[PDB]
Symmetry: C3
């Protein structure tokens, strides 16, 4: 979600600059509230990346199965082992 993030950060430097110009307890708190919103979109993006990473790994296994189908070097064992490791990591 790069687009949403960059707008979330652009909003931050502004809220920051506004805070820096006229510091206030309320201005500080509003600045913190904005930061928690930015981290919420960072987390949502990170969570999305992992979902895509798992989708990639699911695709690789289908490729290795397709390579084993047409007589790939039983090399295929080590690679599918990588996938098992990757699947566990995620």
């Amino acid at each position: 979600g790069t687009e949403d993030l960059k707008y979330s950060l652009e909003r931050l430097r502004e809220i920051l600059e506004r805070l820096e110009e006229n510091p206030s307890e309320k201005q500080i708190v509003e600045a913190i509230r904005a930061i928690v919103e930015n981290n919420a979109q960072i987390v949502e993006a990170i969570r999305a990346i992992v979902e895509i990473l798992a989708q990639i790994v699911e695709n690789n296994r289908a490729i290795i199965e397709a390579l084993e189908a047409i007589g790939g070097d039983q090399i295929l064992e080590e690679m599918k082992k990588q996938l098992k490791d990757l699947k566990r990591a995620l």
Copy 2:
């Protein structure tokens, strides 16, 4: 920029200690500005990750094409679909 991040975070843990030692409106504001810098570093790292996830998907497609050339088609259809879906997410 994993290394750059690690340095960015530890700079933050320091300011947090400095802040907590002598809390001050100016020290709090400095701590907030540093967090934005960290968030900007995190956002820049994420954008880099998504650019790489796209490069992989491009490679998976290229790999599948090569697989289809040397002969099966149903699996090849299933794989290419997952690839298109992944390009959709990005």
Copy 3:
């Protein structure tokens, strides 16, 4: 640490709510500390992702090797191990 994030963020939205109900210099500093802790978790999760992205590139590399073993088109395999080399550098 996808799950830990989800939990580290909820703690933050709460400390934020408490801070908004009662604002105070101590409550502010405690909120900043939680954010550093949250950023520390976000960083640990990113570093994990990149380690995984490196693991994928070594698998694709191993696949393209297997494609060549059984006679994949050298031209295609050339551009494919190329994008593989570029990826390794980007990491």
